[PDB]
Structures are given as C-alpha cells and as structure tokens.
Amino acid sequence: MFAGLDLGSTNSKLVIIKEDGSYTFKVVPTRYEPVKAGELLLKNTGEIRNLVVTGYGRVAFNRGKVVTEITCQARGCHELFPEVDYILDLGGQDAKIIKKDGQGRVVNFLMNDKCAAGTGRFLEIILTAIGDDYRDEDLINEENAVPINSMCTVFAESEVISLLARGTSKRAVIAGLFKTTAKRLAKFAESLGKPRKLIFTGGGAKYPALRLFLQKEMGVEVVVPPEPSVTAALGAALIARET
Amino acid sequence: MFAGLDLGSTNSKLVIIKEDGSYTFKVVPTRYEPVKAGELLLKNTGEIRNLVVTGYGRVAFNRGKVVTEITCQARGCHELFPEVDYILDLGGQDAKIIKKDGQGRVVNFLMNDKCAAGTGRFLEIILTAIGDDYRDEDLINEENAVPINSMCTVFAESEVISLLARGTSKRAVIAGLFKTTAKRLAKFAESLGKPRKLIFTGGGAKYPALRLFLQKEMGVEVVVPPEPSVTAALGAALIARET
Amino acid sequence: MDNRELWKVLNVDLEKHDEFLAPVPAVYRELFLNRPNRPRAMAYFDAVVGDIHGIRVHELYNLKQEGKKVFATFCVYVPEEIINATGSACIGLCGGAQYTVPAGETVLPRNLCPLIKSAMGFKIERICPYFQVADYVVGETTCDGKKKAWEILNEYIPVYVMELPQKKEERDRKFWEEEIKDFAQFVEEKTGVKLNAENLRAGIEKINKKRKALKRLSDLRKHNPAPIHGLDVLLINQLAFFDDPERFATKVNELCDELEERVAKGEGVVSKDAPRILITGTPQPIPHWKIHALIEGAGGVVVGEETCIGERYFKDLVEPAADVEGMLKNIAARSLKVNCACFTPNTGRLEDILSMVQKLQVDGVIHYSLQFCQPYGVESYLVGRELERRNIPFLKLESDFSEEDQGQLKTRIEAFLEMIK
Amino acid sequence: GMDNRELWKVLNVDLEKHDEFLAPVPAVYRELFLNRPNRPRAMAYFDAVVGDIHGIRVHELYNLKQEGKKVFATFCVYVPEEIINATGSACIGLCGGAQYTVPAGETVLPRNLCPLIKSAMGFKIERICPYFQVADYVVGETTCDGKKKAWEILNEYIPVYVMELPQKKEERDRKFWEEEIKDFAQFVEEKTGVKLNAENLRAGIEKINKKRKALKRLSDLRKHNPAPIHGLDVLLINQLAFFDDPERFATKVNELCDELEERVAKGEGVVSKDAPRILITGTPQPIPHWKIHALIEGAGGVVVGEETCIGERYFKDLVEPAADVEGMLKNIAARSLKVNCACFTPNTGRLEDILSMVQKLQVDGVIHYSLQFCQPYGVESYLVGRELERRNIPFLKLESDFSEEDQGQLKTRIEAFLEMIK
Ligand SMILES: Nc1ncnc2c1ncn2[C@@H]1O[C@H](COP(=O)(O)OP(=O)(O)NP(=O)(O)O)[C@@H](O)[C@H]1O
Ligand SMILES: Nc1ncnc2c1ncn2[C@@H]1O[C@H](COP(=O)(O)OP(=O)(O)NP(=O)(O)O)[C@@H](O)[C@H]1O
Ligand code: SF4
Ligand SMILES: [Mg+2]
Ligand SMILES: [Mg+2]
Ligand SMILES: [N+]
Ligand SMILES: [N+]
Ligand SMILES: [N+]
Ligand SMILES: [N+]
Ligand SMILES: [N+]
C-alpha cells in the first residue's frame, strides 16, 4: 500500500511495502517510454495509498509525489546499510556518488559530468555486440586487460573498434572495459571524501567483474544490496510511507 | 578475377571484377571479426589474380595489398560519377569528405574529428530503439524537428533520453536527429571547397531522409550510388586490377 | 520594414536572421511574459527584447552617420568610460546562441567555449545587426580561446587587442595602466576626439551611473521574500551591455523604486521558504537563460550572480580625479579590481563569493561554467573545496547553448534544492 | 632492482602503482625501437637510459640533494635552465606523457583538459614518478589556461614558483620578461644559497648552449636524403634532453652525430629516397608519447623534423654571451622570447619557422599534431593550415590524447595522407 516508482533511462522499477513492513518489487525495461512502463508496472497492483515517483520519467508520469533519485537512493540504501556513509549508483545514463548521515539524509552528492554520460548503456551495448559468454572469473584472471580510454563512450567505442580490428582478444577488451570503468568509478567515488566503506548499487553493480575490479581499486570494503536495481525505488516507497 | 575487400567497422563488402569488366558484390556484417568476415566473403570466389584490402580490418587481414578507404572510395566513386569531384562517405564509425581529380585520384580529404566519431552507429542504434515503424516522407514534412546537440553522440543520447522522457514524439526526435546530422554533414562536406554537386555514399547514404535534408542544407544536387555500401570495395577491386 | 531596410543596409543575411529570430518570441513568452508577479517596470526591458534588433541598432547607425564610431567588446575590462567620453558607443557582443555555433566551428575548434564559437558565427553568418554596425572589435588577452580567436576575427572586422596581465602585483598594475593609455590614444585616433578633463569626467560619470543603478538593484535582492526573480535581473544585466547608458540607468532606477515598494510591504515573488541561490562562474550572455529558468522553475530563487553579467560588471566604480592622467589611472584601477579567473591566484573572487553568501542570505551556491571554459572550470575545484570547509552547500554545473539537456540539469538542481531545504 | 627499489622507498614512491605504471614499457620499447632495424649504434646510450629511466639519473639527483644542491622541476622551455645550472643545481622537465596517471589528475582537474597537464598532476598525486618525488621545487609559467590554473592546485603538494610570461612580444613585454627573469634569479639564489656571478652564470650558459648546439647538430643532419636516422629516434633523444645530465647528454648526442656523418658520406639512410619526408608541427610530445611518429614511420614515411618544444623550439636559439651578470640575464631573457609558442599573439614567427623548415628539410607533407583540449595550438591550427594550403604544401591536422588504442583511426588518416602525397 506504499509504492515507490523509479522510471529510469533504461529500466523502470516498482517497490511496494505492505503494512507488515515486507516488500515486493517489479522491474521492466523503460523502452524510452517511462509513462507506459510505469502504468504497466502499476496495473494489477491493487490500490496504493501513497506513491512516490523518481527517475527520468518522474514528471511525465504526473502521479504521486515527485522526489529525485538522489534522495530516494539515499533513503533506500540507508534501510539496508545504515552504517555506511557513501553510495555509488551506476545506472544506464548517470553515475551518482552520495554521502549520507546517520539518519539517512543526503549531506552531499555529485553526478557525472556531461562527457561521462551513458557509461552503463554503452557497457550493455558493447557486451551484446562483442559477445560476452565467458565467465567473470575469466575477466579477473585476464593478465592482458587492455587499458581503454576513460574519457567517454565515444572515444572508448573508437578504441574497441581499433582493438578488435587488429585481432585483440575479446576477453582482453572486455576485461579492459570493466577495469577502466572501475578505475574511473573509484576516483569518482572519492569525490565527497575518501570512504572507509562503500555501497555500490544500481544495475551497474550487477556486473560481477566490475564489483571486484572496483573493490580492488578502492582498497576498502564494498557492499552491494541484495537487489541493486530496486534500492532507489525502495527509498521512494519508504518516503511514500513516512509521508 | 580482381577483388576488392572493404572490412568496415560495421559491414564488410567484397567486389569481384571479371575479365569482361562486369562485377559482382557481397555484403556481410563484420561482427567485430574482420578476419572471419573477409574469409566468409571470399568463400567459393574462385581464382583471384589480385586482391586489395581496405577498411579498418585491412590491418589484420593477412593477404592482399593494403590501401586506405580514402583512396579506394575516390577510385570507386570515380567509376560511377566521373563528373562529380566531391565525395561524402558516411560509415558507422568515420565520416569522410574527399575531393578527387579527373582520374579518380585523391586531391584532398578530411575525416571526422575524435568527438564526431560513431555518428553512423549511433543512428543505427537509436533507430532500432525507437524508429522502425515510421514513413520516410513523414520525417521530411514533420513540422517540429527538435534541435539536438551537434557535439557528439554522448550529448545527443543525453538529449534524446530527456526528450522522450518528457513525452516528445518519437518521430519528432528522429526527424531532429536526421536534420541535425544533415546540418553538421553539410558544413563538413564544404570543408575542401564548396561542391557544385556532391556524391553521398557509404551506408549512411541509404537513409533517404538524411540525403534530402543534406541536399536542402547544402543547396546543390546530392547524388547517391545505386549501391552506396560497395563503392569503396569497387575502388579496391579497380586498384587491384590496375596493379 | 524600417528594421528590414536597416538590416539590408547593414548587409545582414536576411533569411538566416529571420530563421534565428523565429523561435525567440515564444521562448520569451514562456520564460518571461507569462510568468506571474513580475514588476511593472519590467515593461521597458520586455519592450527592448521585443525589438532587440530595431530601436537600439537604429540609434547606433545614426551615431555613425554623424561621424561617431561603434566599438564592440567581449570583456568587462575594456574601458567603456574612454569610448563614451568621445561620444562614440560601446556594445558588448558575447555570444549566447546555439544557432551560430556551427558557423563559428568553420574556423574554430568544436572543443571550444560556446560563447566564443557563437560570437564568431554571428559575424561569419552576418546574423547580428549589432555586429554588422560595429566599426571595431576591442579584444583582450584573457582566456586562450578568445586570445587566439581574435587573430581569426581580424579577417572580418578590425580587432584591437588589449594586453591584460595575468597577476595583480605592482609591475602588473603599471603594465595595465600603460595598456589603458595606449588604448586611449587608439580611441582618440579612430574618433578624432581628443580626451580632456571635461569629456572624460563625463564619460566616467555616465558609466558610473549605469553601474550604480545595477548595484542598487543587486542590493535590493538581499530582502526576503525576494522582491524579484533572478531571471529578470539576469536579463537586465544582459541588456546593460548594449542599451543606451543614460536611458538604461533611468529605467533600472525606476525598477528599483518599485522594488522598494514591494519590500516595504513584505511582498515577494516566492514563498520565503524557497531556497535562495547564488550563481557563480562564467557570464550568461543573452539569450542563455537556461540555468536561471530551471532553478526558478524548480521553486528556487536566484538572488545574485557572481559573474561578469552580474556582480563582477557593476560592483566597482571609477574614483574621481582632477586631470586626464589621473582619470586614466583610475579607470585602469577600476577594471583591475574585477576578480576574473584568468588572473592567478584569484583569491579575491572567493572573498566576494563568501561575502555575497552572507549579505544575500544564500542557502546554496551553484557554480555554473560553460563547457570547455578552462579558467573557471579549473578554478571550480578550489572554490568548491573552500565552500566545503565553510559548510556552504555547493553544486558544480556545466553546459552549452543546446537546450535539451534540461532533464540532466533538472535532476542535479532539484536534488540540490531537496538537500538544502 | 633492489638498489633502485630502496631509492624509490626513500622518495616515498607508491611502489605498487609505480610497478603497474612501468610494467608495459619494455614491450612497447621493444616493438617501437629495439626491433626496428638500421638504428645507429650510438642509440645504445639512449636505449640504456630508457631501460633504467627511474634509476641512475634519479640516484644522481638524490645525491646532489645530499650535497646541499636543489632539484627544480619545469614544464616549459621558457624557464631559464641557465640560471638553475649556474648554481650547480639540477633542472628537470617533467611534462606528462602517460595515460596511466590521467584519472588521478582528474581528481582535482577537469576531464576536458590537456592530457599533458592531467598526467603530470596525476604523477605527483599518486607518488608514481621518482623524478617528481626528488624535486624540491616546481617552476611554473603563465602560458596556457590549464597550466596557469593548475599551478594553484599543485602548490598544495610541492612549492610552485610561477613566472609571469607576457602574451605579446612588444618592447613593454620584453622589459616585463627581463624583470621576471631577474626575480627568478633572486629566488634561485635564495633557495640554493649560491650567488650568481660572472663566472658561474657564464658556465651555466655555456653548458646549456652546448646541449642545445648538439641537438641543433642532430637536427641539421636530418636534412640529408636519404634520411640517416628515423625521426622516432630523434624524438626520443629530444625527450631525454629534459632529464639527463647536460654534459653527458651533449657528449652522447655528438657521438651519434659523428656516426650519422659517416652514413651521410656514404649515402646510407633508413628509408628509400622516395619515402615521403614529413614535418611534425604543434604541441610537445613528452615521453613516452611515441604514437604519432611510430605510425608515420611504420607506414613508410620518415619524420625529418619537429616544430615543437620537444624538438626545434627547444634548441634552435642559443644565449648570446655577455661579460657581466646583468647582461647575461638580459640575454637569457631574450633567448627564451625567441620561442614562438602559440600562447603569444600574434605568433606569426611560428608560421615562418614552419615554412622555412619545409624548405630546409625538403618536406613532402606537414602533419600538424596537437593534444586534445590544447586550445592555443588547436585554434592556431586554422591559420597555419590555411597558409600552408595557399602555398600548396600538403597538410594533415591530427589530434589525440595519451590513450594508445586509437591507433586505427590515426593510421587511416596518416596512411591516406602518405598515399596522397606519394
Ligand atoms: N544483465 C544485464 N542486462 C542489462 N543491463 C545490465 C545487466 N547487468 C548489468 N546491467 C547494467 O545495468 C544498467 C541499468 O541499470 P539501472 O540502475 O536500471 O539504470 P537506470 O536507473 O534505468 N538509468 P539512470 O537514469 O541512469 O539511473 C545497464 O546500463 C547495464 O550497464
Ligand atoms: N537498413 C540499415 N541497416 C543498418 N544500417 C543502416 C541501414 N540504413 C542505413 N544504415 C547506416 O549504414 C551505416 C554503415 O555503413 P557502412 O558504409 O557499411 O559502414 P562501415 O564501412 O562498416 N564503417 P566505417 O569503418 O566507419 O567506414 C550504419 O552505421 C547505419 O547508420
Ligand atoms: S566526444 Fe567525448 S570528449 Fe568529445 S564532447 Fe563528446 S563526451 Fe566529451
Ligand atoms: Mg537509476
Ligand atoms: Mg566504410
Ligand atoms: N570550380
Ligand atoms: N562580407
Ligand atoms: N609587488
Ligand atoms: N638491428
Ligand atoms: N613597441
């Protein structure tokens, strides 16, 4: 009866909290149509007492109370990790580092610059194209991960083309892509202060090689929600309950 | 008898010229493996006297004489349009403007800058995501082609996301993408001098709306080969024969 | 028709000029005219925008018919006082439109500040009647992109390049005084008007009166509830660069009179729980309204601008002197008080930011700099870090003149407003 | 091995990151240099420098400091090496050339900034460079926007003295720079405790003049047909000029020139006489930024000159002697102001330099290469290309960063150019 709806650039997520405190979640692709995805998500749900909508599609949805994904992500990660002060959210279009206090309140945040947009969607695109059917154990076991340009997805695509055109191993390229992404994310995740411990969430945290490369670059403990896709929507549902 | 192999970033092409001067052509997706694509094209092709290899994959292909796609595109288009001096080749990763002389030799050329890489592939991806179900001529007359950032595909993707997230029509975004691309390509195609007429080739020239928007922006006739995918490969085959 | 005849005489590309001006009225409608609670005294400035390429361009053209000159400038350091002493006109032409960026890119890198690309493109395309009526450009050695672009622009219109130093020690202050003396001789030569105590004091008084009026408007924004939206003040500060200084100062002062009435009744344009925002960074030339419009569209109110279309332009007034030599020294000193990031170090700017946060009762600072502006882009690191040490909320934004990244900017701005509420 | 590792320890190098940085260098050097045939025997000295690039020279600098001397790090050819060397202190140029350190530099710098700046900042922040770790001071300069504003940040990690270079070369500017040189001389005296006098300043001038003269001698030999040395080898030598002992370096350069004179006298070279001769112009290529030369010469061209500050702009101009310190300082200032960097306006002398080099070196094409987001050289490339095309000089504009894997894009552009000018 308390719903949180996260209409992201790539996927839309619905979390519903029952009176008992338990919760369920639903995830569907956004398909560049946030309104339709959210309506598909909310049908057959039963009647909802309060809704909070977040994500790129939040305004167009024209329902419920609108809250940015920065505030929602902080609220949802605090429910799961009240003792960790820093959150890294990698989505399909934006990357976010958030600092929160003991009560879950955002005390500082930063999002990617313009040239750093779209990293997650690029990784999704390139993995299907290259063909990713080795396990991550192969990727971390790769001794010749190729450094790939960290500037942006344009320069990185140009290098992937050059590398594969020359006959470089797809595993060396894929390993290099995760490794360079992890290196950039580690420096980004220290923007608000050097964390002693880091929460890594968003669909980006579902890549096993990226989690491991990130933890190695960070040099500190990393924790990942049970379901990183939905922690922002859970935060919205907790806000919906509290208000 | 004489073969030209164009191992492009997205597609690979083979033209075989016979002794009579006739020629046949074949296209396959490169799938990031130009060695495999080249051997596939050459399967069952008979006894080749000379082979020229061009495109990204020429660096890896272990036989044939290597020639850049600038020189080959000039020679191939000269066979079709000896009267037109300027060639715009829009591929998946690079854009090329070429000025040729009366023998199809390169007089000057320019390729896209680093931030302009990947325009072709970006159009392919975005059309797959949002645009298959639209008439071509409904784009030409669309009254609200939205301006989209001309900087690079990262910035454009960011704007496409915001535009569709606030409910802008798919067709208005597609028209805006094509119009903005035509405007950048018009300035690009004047880089070597103002053409009295322009050959528009490569796979990018197969978008009919792009050609018409380009022609309107440039104010001169834009001619497209009957098969723009294979004109560089034809150039390679003619150089193979001439050597 | 009278406008269209003037543009033809100025050799404007009429079709492109029409295409450029086509979307403007609707944007102004959306962001200004249809916005409620605007002071009645905005009507004058709305009228200026309404005929932005008419009345004023006519006045400039008629000035040239009498033998006066039109100097175009791109930086607050160029001494408006000396030009106006001679009766000639000074207009600031920094670019703020995406329409002309591709034209600028025919001769400039694409990875360059869009202010520069847009300005160059205006001249190349012959889109801008102000640029077409200008006799000279007065450039300055500030950022790399401007300094090197002047070498290219000189092929289209004569460019006089003033050499600004890069520090503010005594040797630098003397150097700049000598540059101002050389520039004065150039204006005298081009106008045929010799500076004397009388006409230079008059030039100083005219520009000082313009700056003082903008200082008065800036001070009134310290009141809560804010008596005027920041988007309207940005527009006024933008028009300061090419309106007639006497008429402009009069209309700004009339606006201030009306804002004083609002304050006396505790009337404002926002609730008083709305977050009050200071913008700091690069100038936002007309019509680059995006950032203010998004902040205030999200429920905030911008109460000041630490930029050169903003506080850096009008804060410092010329002190009087008895003779021409003393006045030129004081004109040079006035401009060198401007704390631009092209100077090193630029500690004065940080002091200005902190002072503005206190006086304007600011809840959060948005540092906005144009993409590829390296002086302000690099300096943003030390600014943000010091505001961190002082527990001042801080958000760094960058963008260009394209409009459709609003979705990205909105989420950053709205998350910031949520955080500081 | 062990002895180097203890030195890096004392210098507080991050040993693990340092190993990761150096790990791929030997393979690149093997592919681009050691496996390339027909290199002069006298390249052995420089190959051995690269093989111990963080060893013997860093030991020498550490030992100088233990004697009470100082190590000054510089990033611009305008800083007067002559004044530093007069005191017996060392001057090392640390312009960054490595992608490895760029993400670290981006923790405090914008990502849309020149990679030279980002890479050098990252070396300092990460404690990855033994030379940056042994340096006592950085001498900065008010050249490009990125460097100028980066010095304010770098000063938190290492003291930075900023010299104010003017932006024009009129008389007022020349006098201004003379005063900046005198101020810098006083700073050097204060930090070293060594007063400049006629004897030691003349000796410092002679030592740096001798180094520049050796590189001028090497550059002149590249005018011969066939080219007697590949340009990539000369770039390496010009890069190492910024770190090596000036007297040893000049001796080894002159020994190379003696060998090359023997090649010239027998008509031996590294290419056929029909191979296209290429002039590079633009930004400096700091070590190990070898990509552009490697691609040109791997495509069968030969680079016969570099109009850059790791190249002709560094060594072209020598200090004129004078009898007293006041006159030597004015002549040191005048030498550096002969450098035609794009940070000056106008910079018409650089175009004239380019056109002169095209004739002196009998160049078949000019490749203008500048680093991404270098606005001084990026903007100026328009007027350069326009004049060269007016004079029917083949011209190719290239831009890149330190990331090595845009090879295919650059290769097509370079090879299409060589095909065109053949
Ligand atoms: N198996 C997978 N399939 C698809 N995407 C995956 C997968 N594993 C990881 N991902 C990543 O998950 C990302 C999407 O994460 P998500 O958090 O849902 O983004 P979003 O919230 O929709 N977009 P944003 O607006 O930037 O916050 C993709 O871009 C991929 O990089
Ligand atoms: N129906 C279509 N299907 C796919 N691509 C299409 C289609 N119509 C047009 N295109 C465009 O054709 C482009 C590919 O052209 P092509 O000339 O084959 O590139 P390429 O030679 O492989 N790459 P490059 O290395 O940059 O020269 C794609 O990027 C699309 O934008
Ligand atoms: S191509 Fe990359 S570096 Fe260039 S503007 Fe786009 S995101 Fe930035
Ligand atoms: Mg998300
Ligand atoms: Mg192709
Ligand atoms: N012609
Ligand atoms: N003109
Ligand atoms: N001083
Ligand atoms: N060899
Ligand atoms: N002078």
UniProtKB/TrEMBL annotation, chains A, B:
What cofactors does this protein use? [4Fe-4S] cluster
- Per the UniProt record, one Pfam family is BcrAD_BadFG
Q: Which PANTHER family match?
A: BIFUNCTIONAL PROTEIN [INCLUDES 2-HYDROXYACYL-COA DEHYDRATASE (N-TER) AND ITS ACTIVATOR DOMAIN (C_TERM), BIFUNCTIONAL PROTEIN [INCLUDES 2-HYDROXYACYL-COA DEHYDRATASE (N-TER) AND ITS ACTIVATOR DOMAIN (C_TERM)-RELATED
Q: Which GO terms describe its molecular function?
A: 4 iron, 4 sulfur cluster binding; metal ion binding; nucleotide binding
Tell me the residue numbers annotated for binding ADP. Answer: T10, N11, K13, G92, G120, E124, G203, Y207
Keyword Transferase tagged: no
Species source reads Carboxydothermus hydrogenoformans (strain ATCC BAA-161 / DSM 6008 / Z-2901)
Query: Where is the ATPase BadF/BadG/BcrA/BcrD type domain positioned along the sequence?
Result: 4-240
Q: Which domain of life does the protein's organism represent?
A: Bacteria
Listed A to Z, the keywords are:
4Fe-4S, Iron, Iron-sulfur, Metal-binding, Nucleotide-binding
What the entry lists under InterPro entries is as follows: ATPase_BadF, ATPase_NBD, CoA_E_activase_dom, Dehydratase_Activator_Redct
- UniProt: [4Fe-4S] cluster binding residues: C115, C152
Secretion signal, residue range per the UniProt entry: none
Q: What is this protein called?
A: Putative CoA-substrate-specific enzyme activase
UniProtKB/TrEMBL annotation, chain D:
Q: Which cofactor does it need?
A: [4Fe-4S] cluster
What's the name of the protein? Dehydratase family protein
Pfam families listed in its UniProt record:
HGD-D (PF06050)
State the family it belongs to: Belongs to the FldB/FldC dehydratase alpha/beta subunit family.
Q: Which UniProt key words apply to this protein? A: Iron, Iron-sulfur, Metal-binding
Q: Which organism is it from?
A: Carboxydothermus hydrogenoformans (strain ATCC BAA-161 / DSM 6008 / Z-2901)
GO MF entries: hydro-lyase activity; iron-sulfur cluster binding
